[PDB]
Structure 1
Amino acid sequence: STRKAVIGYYFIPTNQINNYTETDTSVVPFPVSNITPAKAKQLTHINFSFLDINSNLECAWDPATNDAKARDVVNRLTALKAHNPSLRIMFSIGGWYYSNDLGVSHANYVNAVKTPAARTKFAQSCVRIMKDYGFDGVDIDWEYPQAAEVDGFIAALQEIRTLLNQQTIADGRQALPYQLTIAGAGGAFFLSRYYSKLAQIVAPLDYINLMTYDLAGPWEKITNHQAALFGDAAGPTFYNALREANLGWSWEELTRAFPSPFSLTVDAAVQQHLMMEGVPSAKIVMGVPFYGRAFKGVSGGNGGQYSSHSTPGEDPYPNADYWLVGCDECVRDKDPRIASYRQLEQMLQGNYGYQRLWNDKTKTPYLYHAQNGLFVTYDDAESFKYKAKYIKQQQLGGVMFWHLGQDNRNGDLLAALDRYFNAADYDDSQLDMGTGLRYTGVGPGNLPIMTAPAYVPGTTYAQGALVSYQGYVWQTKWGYITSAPGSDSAWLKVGRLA
């Protein structure tokens, strides 16, 4: 029954706020008025982005922001709620630019969560901003707290939660209670910063919106799909950093949960969350990108997949060679490395030399430009069928995407997601999910259902024997074992009784 969340980022830069207008797309390419009533019904959340944490360690707009124009923009978004009583306008604190390890505001994030009093002041500023501008909830997109910061971050979220709950009571908003989300890591290297404390991070949240995209990029040496649903054995694999997380698990426990190397996929990130105890599937939201990543200097043979390449990683783009043929938005933005889905349709449709190819293991499309040696990894309405099917099958909370301004003009990507979850006449019972590589890790949070003969005292069990005892199915790690399962280190808990 429960409606899947559909969570769309709305991003607008400070200069566009300060010059806001709905009638000149050279000033504001994606005004609020582009979010029509029909789009509004298809969304459950819009994440307005981005606010920041200032040096006073409070949530704040960019100080260069014209406040009356900011209100007017936010008012336009909340007016959308008139077409859809389920819809929320969240706001988002952070983003890569403000909050990455080398970001301009980074130290503010670290300091805002550092002490009890700092957290109280920060938490209060969050709810005060929410109430003053008319937002429906708080999203945190710190990319990413690390190590020593994680306990502070967790405490900050717990405190925001309580303050949100007070506010919900004060405004009688039990029908649409104020909510708390974060944008979570969607790959294991960044996820490993807070993985051991994942249950604590998720507990105060309504959702954790996994950034299961940007899993490939110019910083990797080999081209790859940025959001492969499942793995391709011909593609690159990666060290599983999670096996070095401070978990206190045994060798066998670590090995069964964290195969290494592994395929960096959407399914991997999702399963890595489900493996942890106290992380419920309904709180897990799959991120998807409404943009492609482009690579140049690729050699042929497999459509530009898994190729070396010559794409600069530096920021800003180091020159004016805008080599993404047909991408007009790339010229406007002076960077050929990322193109909106909206632009990609146009590139494919014009005579620009791209073929649209399909990897049936990853269930994702890609563009290949054979003449110039270009490769583009992106998602479309077809890749979203498989992802939506996976969302229903794994009982996830829904879908998130970055970002709304990158859909095509008729918003076909958002309409597709809405249809795959909610349309009466859409049927995916026969959609084939393929033979791509699944992440097979098992941990305490996702033990499969199993049967086996009851454990018998006095019996000598060989290596690999399976018994049932006190709620679970257990496996001997070596032989010959006669101890009761769970009473020493010889037995591995591998499954649970119906």
Structure 2
Amino acid sequence: STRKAVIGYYFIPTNQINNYTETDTSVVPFPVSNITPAKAKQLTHINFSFLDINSNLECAWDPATNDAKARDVVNRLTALKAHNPSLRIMFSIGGWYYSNDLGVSHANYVNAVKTPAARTKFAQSCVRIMKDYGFDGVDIDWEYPQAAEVDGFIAALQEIRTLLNQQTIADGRQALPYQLTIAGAGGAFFLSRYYSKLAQIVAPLDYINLMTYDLAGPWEKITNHQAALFGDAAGPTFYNALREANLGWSWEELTRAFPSPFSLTVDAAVQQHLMMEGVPSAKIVMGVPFYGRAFKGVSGGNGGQYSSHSTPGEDPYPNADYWLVGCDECVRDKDPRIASYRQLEQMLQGNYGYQRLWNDKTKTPYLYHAQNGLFVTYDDAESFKYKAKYIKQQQLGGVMFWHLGQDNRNGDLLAALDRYFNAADYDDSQLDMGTGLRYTGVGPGNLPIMTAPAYVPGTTYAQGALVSYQGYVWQTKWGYITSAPGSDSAWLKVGRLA
């Protein structure tokens, strides 16, 4: 019973920093003061976002940033630590806008990690920004290094870790050591870019915060849940790209690890991490969305699930038709495709025509607007019970979420996560996790415990025979085999001894 991490992004754009105020929500909708002492206590980390990498290949604020206002906002966050001596204010470098393959700063990420000298300079800039502004650690949210750049990225994290460790010693911060995290891919297509080197990536980290949300969106042909915990056989499935990663595994090893097609769920991403040797469950943090994704143009029959739709994917949103009925924040932000949980409660409570439905396979809620043909996929305090139960059962490190401003005013989502993990009186021992589709892949990092008769030399084993030998349970790939398990290619390591 180590405390689960509870990691909340605090995102504030440059224009809001530069006009920062705590008394006008039309300029800053979500000021630091909305994070009350009670919320501060429920959080373990706050990820201040986003810093960038500049063309000097250093960690830097957006250069339009007013530095005194920036320091002041950051000081308000670090003052929160007075209510909670476990609390850290991290900062994040990257995000989609800055760091995506076509993002505005993308070449800076590539070049910052490309060579030994560039990495030294970058790493030093991170620690220096951390100490100058009073942050408690470094989060990297590069979406995403491509297979060629992965060795540099790894080396960059290793170097940052060493510098963080020096800093923790210099400041005598062993009670709350400076930390290093990344925001990891939560679906196999991006994950496949660095999957083969996952143990190396995770080794220098305190946590890898899986972005296990945005698993559906307007870029797909068919509506779906953006953060299904388990799979729905009625729903779409996807090619498992991990089976083409450069792993050096055999056909049978790849097949047993990477079923395809597969359901793109939270459970899949988590298992895909656990399958790798050297990736410990305690370092894996499950991301959850504090917002819904909305689609229009959907047909009926199944609550708007798994339907074609007409939601534009362009960015910025390409006209002024704000068709997400009742969503006032969408008008403010000029995009009807995303609604905060905060806004969604209001849409459901007003006379706007939505029903709240529940998929008992995915263990996630959804809104359906029968009259206009709208579907919204989001998470709430109910879906979080199952996700928290899963976090406990799988011995994950905790939960991360984007983002704090999207909680409702009383902070019920955060409170709920804090309760499912820490409340003495909350009991989920009978919470039924459903018959949704589990990801069944097995790999070297997550072998099940098994028993079988001991291997006997001289015996002819038929295809599919199971024996135990030198700590493991092995299975013949064909028959008849007589070789000692592990000595040639005929035997598959399927389990570990009892």
TM-score > 0.5, shorter chain as reference = yes
In structure 1, distance between residues paired with 2:423 and 2:303 = 35
In structure 1, distance between residues paired with 2:90 and 2:410 = 23
Q: Kindly state the Cα deviation for residue 147 of structure 1 after the two structures are TM-superposed.
A: 1.2
Residue number in structure 1 paired with 2:211: 211
In structure 2, distance between residues paired with 1:76 and 1:379 = 29
In structure 2, distance between residues paired with 1:365 and 1:422 = 24
Is the aligned partner of 1:155 residue 2:160? no
Q: Kindly state the Cα deviation for residue 421 of structure 1 after the two structures are TM-superposed.
A: 0.1
In structure 2, distance between residues paired with 1:438 and 1:454 = 30
Q: Kindly state the Cα deviation for residue 225 of structure 1 after the two structures are TM-superposed.
A: 0.1
Q: Kindly state the Cα deviation for residue 35 of structure 1 after the two structures are TM-superposed.
A: 0.1
In structure 2, distance between residues paired with 1:485 and 1:194 = 31
Q: Kindly state the Cα deviation for residue 291 of structure 1 after the two structures are TM-superposed.
A: 0.2
Structure 2's unaligned 5+ residue stretches are none
Residue number in structure 2 paired with 1:85: 85
Q: How does 1:170-189 map to 2 (within 5 A)?
A: 170-189=170-189
Q: Kindly state the Cα deviation for residue 326 of structure 1 after the two structures are TM-superposed.
A: 0.1
Q: Kindly state the Cα deviation for residue 316 of structure 1 after the two structures are TM-superposed.
A: 1.2
Q: Kindly state the Cα deviation for residue 433 of structure 1 after the two structures are TM-superposed.
A: 0.1
Task: Output one character per residue of 1:261-285: Cα deviation in whole Å (capped at 9) or x when no partner.
Answer: 0000000000000000000000000
In structure 2, distance between residues paired with 1:302 and 1:174 = 54
Secondary structure (helix, strand or coil) at the match of 2:450 reads coil
Q: Kindly state the Cα deviation for residue 52 of structure 1 after the two structures are TM-superposed.
A: 0.1
Task: Output one character per residue of 1:373-428: Cα deviation in whole Å (capped at 9) or x when no partner.
Answer: 00000000000000000000000000000000000000000000000000000000
Q: Kindly state the Cα deviation for residue 16 of structure 1 after the two structures are TM-superposed.
A: 0.4
Structure 1's unaligned 5+ residue stretches are none
Q: Kindly state the Cα deviation for residue 339 of structure 1 after the two structures are TM-superposed.
A: 0.3
Task: Output one character per residue of 1:215-267: Cα deviation in whole Å (capped at 9) or x when no partner.
Answer: 00000000000000000000000000000000000000000000000000000
In structure 1, distance between residues paired with 2:389 and 2:319 = 42
In structure 2, distance between residues paired with 1:365 and 1:125 = 43
In structure 1, distance between residues paired with 2:125 and 2:283 = 25
Q: Kindly state the Cα deviation for residue 162 of structure 1 after the two structures are TM-superposed.
A: 0.1
Q: Kindly state the Cα deviation for residue 138 of structure 1 after the two structures are TM-superposed.
A: 0.1
In structure 1, distance between residues paired with 2:276 and 2:162 = 24
Tell me how many residue pairs correspond in the alignment: 498
Secondary structure (helix, strand or coil) at the match of 1:332 reads helix
In structure 1, distance between residues paired with 2:121 and 2:127 = 10
Is the aligned partner of 1:120 residue 2:86? no
In structure 1, distance between residues paired with 2:61 and 2:240 = 38
Q: Kindly state the Cα deviation for residue 315 of structure 1 after the two structures are TM-superposed.
A: 1.1
In structure 2, distance between residues paired with 1:479 and 1:334 = 64
Task: Output one character per residue of 1:338-376: Cα deviation in whole Å (capped at 9) or x when no partner.
Answer: 000000000000000000000000000000000000000
Secondary structure (helix, strand or coil) at the match of 1:313 reads coil
In structure 2, distance between residues paired with 1:134 and 1:318 = 40
In structure 1, distance between residues paired with 2:441 and 2:105 = 37
Secondary structure (helix, strand or coil) at the match of 2:482 reads coil
In structure 1, distance between residues paired with 2:260 and 2:107 = 34
Q: Kindly state the Cα deviation for residue 30 of structure 1 after the two structures are TM-superposed.
A: 0.1
Q: How does 1:419-498 map to 2 (within 5 A)?
A: 419-498=419-498
Task: Output one character per residue of 1:48-86: Cα deviation in whole Å (capped at 9) or x when no partner.
Answer: 000000000000000000000000000000000000000
Secondary structure (helix, strand or coil) at the match of 2:174 reads coil
RMSD of aligned residue pairs (Cα, Å):
0.3
Secondary structure (helix, strand or coil) at the match of 2:417 reads helix
In structure 1, distance between residues paired with 2:315 and 2:457 = 66
The TM-score normalised by the length of structure 2 is 1.00
Task: Output one character per residue of 1:198-222: Cα deviation in whole Å (capped at 9) or x when no partner.
Answer: 0000000000000000000000000
Secondary structure (helix, strand or coil) at the match of 1:65 reads coil
Q: How does 1:25-64 map to 2 (within 5 A)?
A: 25-64=25-64
In structure 1, distance between residues paired with 2:236 and 2:102 = 28
Q: Kindly state the Cα deviation for residue 493 of structure 1 after the two structures are TM-superposed.
A: 0.2
Task: Output one character per residue of 1:186-208: Cα deviation in whole Å (capped at 9) or x when no partner.
Answer: 00000000000000000000000
In structure 1, distance between residues paired with 2:245 and 2:318 = 37
Secondary structure (helix, strand or coil) at the match of 1:382 reads helix
In structure 2, distance between residues paired with 1:416 and 1:278 = 32
Q: Kindly state the Cα deviation for residue 130 of structure 1 after the two structures are TM-superposed.
A: 0.2
